[PDB]
């Protein structure tokens, strides 16, 4: 045998943690991605990219730290340590938000290594790899928001930062400037994810209460752990129950377990389509007919028209410090207020 | 011939019918029929509803120039408060519709019906000789139903602060709630979000693993029933890779190597998550709010250094000043 064959069979030993060809992309990239988040949310500042503090060394707690984004003038720059901005200086590199990109890109290739790992593992045991396919819903979300979306904006500064309060901020930001709740694709995302949680609770409960071996002692001697269950309950008692409660039930176990896979995944995919649409600031912001009808008759008032006023507020009062590079100054007589209507 | 009381009492308690009708069902059917029928008629053609007691109504009906994404049933006026307010509490019908009575009628009938629905689930499980506590899982959506339609209005003191029954209505409620109680920084909603993302994750995983494992299942089937042996073939081998990575930690977290606990864990995770966030909205009705981090960091010259939480508090001001029209001088408020 040649050295290649010897390498290949070293990588696929039965052992506690599986290395594999996929491991070579996954493990260093994952370590550096994760570890960069940690070293940065403990030490690295953002006084120079946003005018904030965001690390423990400065004062902050677990919810208010973050590794934050670059400044707006940096463009879509890679932010290489050897690039023509840092020039081989680890301090400036930390100061310019250069390691947000480090984390992001290393985590993206860590994602890629994980899905390959799922393929070749599943190839080894010789089963269909549906879980690798399910896992491309998280990849879709990741790349459409953390990579594609600010690449449609003017800079990475409008990308979300890795941190709890920073992404709470992302929520309120999108609410204000895109009115993201009124977009049919996010509605389809909400329906999908909530339906996943619905199937999860209903299935667990139904199965746990149609168990075989409720009387005499277990006549089930295996698992056989890779079977999950499905042997341990009676399809007929559950199907008969739900045909009377709800009036429709599944009569095929395989199709039930396929529905549970379909729902959250199509869910994530649709919300991905919507947010890659927001990346060119095409917004289902308003119904044209409602605006006309409100202009001509100003006693018309809708829960929707209220949401527009509130979002105007979010934008106007949050902008100067969320975009401190624009230098917004709003005299207080120009800001919007309820008592002024 | 069998004494109509027993013909009635047999026909109701029958487990042979198409859809079960229970003793709880005898209460579920008229309350749900009222709630559903009043909602269809109201979502189409309810007259505009003064909801703030300033005589400026808010439209909510398709025939009055809304589409369905901008429609809602608009809560009762600010003059009602917690008062019971049926039809015969109004001296004419048009002032009843103007005051937003339909909302109250709907939400009371629905709450009654939901509890009866939970009850009927317990009853059929008892009847078929099943185990109980599928309804215990169902108490999670009932709890949030209670919190957002009954408990949060009582704490705020009016049925005009309840969640409107609509699409844009629901989103308006969310926005004006975050503005005053800062719920993202409240932990009980966080346990809720964790439950929902985790529920979706575990749903996806369970589906994918089982649906590759199963080869084929079969049961003999006759001309009105199912057979004698529910047969299935599933694969029963696996590699040390997944055992050392995923298997070791689900078995350690169940603190049992039985895979009986898998579906158990499956049921428990969203339900418990959603219980805690249902606690959140309830306790927030009594004006106990989430975290606020303000001026966490200042330098030694007495100048504040902003944090990522201060941007959020600025948006809270933004939404809140628009959500009071009442005076310019609102000093200390709620309640």
């Amino acid at each position: 045998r040649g050295w290649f064959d010897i390498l290949d069979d070293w990588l696929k030993r039965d052992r506690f943690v599986f290395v594999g060809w996929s491991g070579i992309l996954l493990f260093p990239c994952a370590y550096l991605a994760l570890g960069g988040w940690l070293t940065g949310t403990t030490f690295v500042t953002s006084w120079y990219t946003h005018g904030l503090a965001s690390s423990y060394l400065e004062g902050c707690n677990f919810l208010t730290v973050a590794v934050s984004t670059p400044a707006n003038s940096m463009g879509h720059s890679l932010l290489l340590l050897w690039g023509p901005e840092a020039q081989g200086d680890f301090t400036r590199w930390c100061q310019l938000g250069g390691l947000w990109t480090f984390i992001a890109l290393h985590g993206a290739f860590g994602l890629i290594g994980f899905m390959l790992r799922q393929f070749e593992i599943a190839r080894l045991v010789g089963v269909r790899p549906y879980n690798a396919i399910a896992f491309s819903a998280p990849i879709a979300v990741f790349v459409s928001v953390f990579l594609i979306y600010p690449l449609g904006q003017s800079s990475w500064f409008f990308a979300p930062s890795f941190g709890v309060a920073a992404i709470f901020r992302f929520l309120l930001f999108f609410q204000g400037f895109h009115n993201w709740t009124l977009n049919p694709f996010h509605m389809m995302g909400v329906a999908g994810v909530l339906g996943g949680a619905l199937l999860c609770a209903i299935h667990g409960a139904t199965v746990e209460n149609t168990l075989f071996q409720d009387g005499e002692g277990a006549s089930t001697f295996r698992a056989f752990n890779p079977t999950q269950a499905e042997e341990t309950y009676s399809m007929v008692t559950a199907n008969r129950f739900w045909s009377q409660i709800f009036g429709i039930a599944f009569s095929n176990k395989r199709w039930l377990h396929f529905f549970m896979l379909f729902v959250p995944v199509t869910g994530l995919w649709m919300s991905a389509i919507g947010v890659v649409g927001l990346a060119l600031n095409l917004r289902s912001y308003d119904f044209i007919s409602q605006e006309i009808r409100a202009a001509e008759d100003p006693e018309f008032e809708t829960f929707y028209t209220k949401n527009l006023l509130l979002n105007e507020g979010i934008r106007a009062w949050m902008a100067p410090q969320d975009q401190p590079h624009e230098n917004f100054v709003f005299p207080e007589e120009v800001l919007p207020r309820g008592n002024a209507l | 011939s069998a004494n109509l009381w027993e013909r009635f009492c047999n026909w109701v308690t029958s487990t042979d019918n198409r859809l079960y009708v229970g003793w709880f069902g005898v209460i579920m059917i008229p309350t749900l029929l009222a709630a559903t029928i009043c909602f269809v008629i109201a979502f189409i053609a309810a007259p505009p509803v003064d909801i703030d007691g300033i005589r400026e109504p808010v439209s909510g009906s398709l025939l009055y120039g809304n589409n369905i994404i901008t429609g809602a049933v608009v809560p009762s006026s600010n003059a009602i408060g917690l008062h019971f307010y049926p039809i015969w509490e109004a001296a004419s019908l048009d002032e009843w519709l103007y005051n937003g009575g339909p909302y109250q009628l709907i939400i009371f009938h629905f709450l009654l019906g939901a509890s009866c629905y939970m009850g009927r689930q317990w009853e059929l499980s008892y009847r078929l000789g099943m185990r109980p506590w599928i309804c215990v899982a169902y108490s999670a959506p009932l709890a949030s139903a209670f919190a957002v339609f009954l408990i949060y209005p009582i704490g705020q003191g009016s049925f005009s602060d309840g969640m409107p029954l609509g699409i844009s209505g629901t989103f308006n409620f969310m926005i004006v709630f975050q503005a005053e109680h800062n719920i993202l920084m409240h932990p009980f909603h966080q346990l809720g979000v964790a439950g929902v993302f985790g529920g979706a994750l575990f749903c996806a995983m369970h589906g994918s693993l089982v649906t590759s494992s199963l080869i084929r299942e079969t049961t003999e089937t006759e001309s009105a029933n199912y057979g004698y042996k529910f047969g299935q073939e599933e694969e029963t081998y696996n590699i040390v890779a997944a055992h050392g990575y995923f298997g070791r930690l689900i078995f350690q977290y169940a603190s049992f190597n039985n895979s009986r606990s898998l579906h158990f864990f499956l049921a428990a995770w969203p339900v418990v998550g959603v219980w805690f966030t249902a606690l959140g909205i309830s306790t927030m009705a009594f004006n106990l709010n989430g975290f606020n981090f303000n001026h966490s960091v200042i330098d030694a010259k007495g100048n504040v250094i902003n944090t990522w939480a201060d941007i959020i508090n600025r948006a809270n001001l933004g939404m809140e000043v628009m959500h009071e029209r009442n005076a310019h001088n609102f000093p200390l408020d709620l309640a």
């Binding site: 009036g247 429709i248 009569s251 | 198409r18 859809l19 189409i44 398709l62 025939l63 589409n67 369905i68 089937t221 199912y226």
Partner: peptide
Amino acid sequence: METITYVFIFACIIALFFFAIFFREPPR
């Protein structure tokens, strides 16, 4: 013409409910 469309498509959903409950396949 718009309100008509909304109520018509809803009318169709409840008819779908009725048939899917009382006229479903036999389980064979």
